[PDB]
């Protein structure tokens, strides 16, 4: 068992992701290594990320699903909860992880995080201050980074 169990579950999640893909997400194994995936999220409509293509890297632990996956952006994005290293401040990836959760539900959570940031528990305090104080400036800068880094 163990690693074999993680492999079987990751195949199951990959097939499910293929047949019922989350909105504006697509993800898959990189080559023949199924513990390393690459994903893309299209910037949601009616958000300052619209039109962008945002790339994410996923690493499944050896104890999956008993440890959460490690998920990071490789695309620069202007977001209160995503730092310059692409790290994501997201509860279901750290403290609300359950082995019942699936990579497809991780991806939904990240898209919702793009639509609805959490500035009261921020990963980049300056961007959270701007988000709370001057929303239009926030949206303008997020659009500018979408055009500069994600298009």
């Amino acid at each position: 068992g163990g690693i074999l169990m993680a492999l079987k579950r990751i195949h199951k999640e990959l097939n499910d992701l293929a047949r019922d893909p989350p909105a504006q997400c697509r993800a898959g194994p990189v080559g023949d290594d199924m513990f390393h995936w690459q994903a893309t999220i299209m910037g949601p409509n009616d958000s300052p990320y619209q039109g962008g293509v945002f790339f994410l890297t996923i690493h499944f632990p050896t104890d999956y699903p008993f440890k959460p996956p490690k998920v990071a952006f490789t695309t620069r994005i202007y977001h209160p909860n995503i730092n310059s290293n692409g790290s994501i401040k997201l509860d279901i990836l750290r403290s609300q992880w359950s082995p019942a959760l699936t990579i497809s539900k991780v991806l939904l959570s990240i898209c919702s995080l793009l639509c609805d940031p959490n500035p009261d528990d921020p990963l980049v305090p300056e961007i959270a201050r701007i988000y709370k104080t001057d929303r239009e400036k926030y949206n303008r800068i997020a659009r500018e980074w979408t055009q500069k880094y994600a298009m």
């Binding site: 104890d63 310059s84 290293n85 790290s87 401040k89 403290s95 019942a100 300056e126």
Partner: protein, 265 residues
């Protein structure tokens, strides 16, 4: 050839016998240590082996020398069935071989096959494989939907997530579900979750950008180290917050207060 005083076998699988403690010239499985029926825990978990003094462990070994394991028929049995009508002694690995149950709460009682706790009683969602036939290797949850899991999968979940985050996978029950798990034999460590205890876990997460990205850094400790006051303190960009520097490397002053980096201009 290191061996356990209480069960007299190789260290084996930590998932099943616990971490193989060896300290102060003594060697014991952690489960053998806390599950032995008569070993007093009389210290700070700093002191001795997690609150078990070596004098007391040695004396427990001596007592257990006068006990035959009903499984392997050899001396050294450190665990006794806690049913009132039973006198069966056994080693912990031998009890697992014969399907004995060990509880990890209160008096840490252990039971043999005939007198162990039971429950009235598809694919285990945790592993996504078909439930084991032998209904002693499966386990329900009282919380909701009467969900059944592999025993091994729930134990692995309890070990990785640990007490603080161990909950019903569906309804997030943290009161009745773990109590029912305890009474049927699930170890629930009182420790932080596994994904928090990884080396360098969530290190580059947060790790508030602290690095001097000026054309030349004016400071010996370098772009990597900072202080609290003076021209050697750290300042970050007003918008990105991901590009910063030692104050004097931009040769700036406390009379502006709003630093925007090269990029955010």
């Amino acid at each position: 050839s290191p061996v356990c005083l209480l069960c007299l076998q190789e260290p084996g699988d930590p998932e099943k016998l616990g971490e193989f403690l060896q300290k102060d010239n003594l060697c014991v499985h952690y489960f053998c240590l806390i599950l032995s029926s008569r070993l007093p825990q009389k210290g700070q978990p700093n002191r001795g082996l997690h609150g078990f003094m070596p004098e007391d462990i040695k004396r427990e070994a001596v007592r257990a020398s006068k006990k035959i394991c009903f499984v392997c028929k050899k001396k050294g049995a450190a665990i006794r069935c806690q049913n009132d009508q039973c006198v069966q002694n056994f080693h912990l690995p031998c009890g697992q071989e014969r399907g004995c149950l060990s509880q990890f709460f209160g008096e840490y009682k252990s039971y043999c096959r005939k007198h162990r706790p039971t429950q009235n009683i598809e694919s285990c969602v945790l592993c996504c494989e078909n439930l084991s036939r032998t209904s002693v290797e499966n386990i329900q949850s009282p919380c909701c939907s009467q969900a059944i899991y592999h025993r091994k999968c729930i134990q692995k979940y309890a070990h990785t997530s640990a007490k603080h985050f161990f909950k019903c996978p569906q309804c997030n029950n943290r009161e009745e579900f773990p109590q029912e798990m305890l009474r049927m034999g699930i170890h629930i460590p009182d420790r932080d979750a596994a994904w928090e205890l990884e080396p360098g876990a969530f290190s580059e997460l947060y790790q508030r950008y602290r690095h001097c990205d000026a054309p030349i850094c004016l400071y010996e400790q370098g772009r990597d180290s900072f202080e609290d006051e003076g021209r050697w303190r750290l300042i970050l960009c007003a918008t990105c917050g991901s590009h910063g520097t030692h104050r004097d490397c931009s040769s700036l002053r406390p009379n502006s207060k709003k630093w925007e980096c090269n990029e955010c201009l």
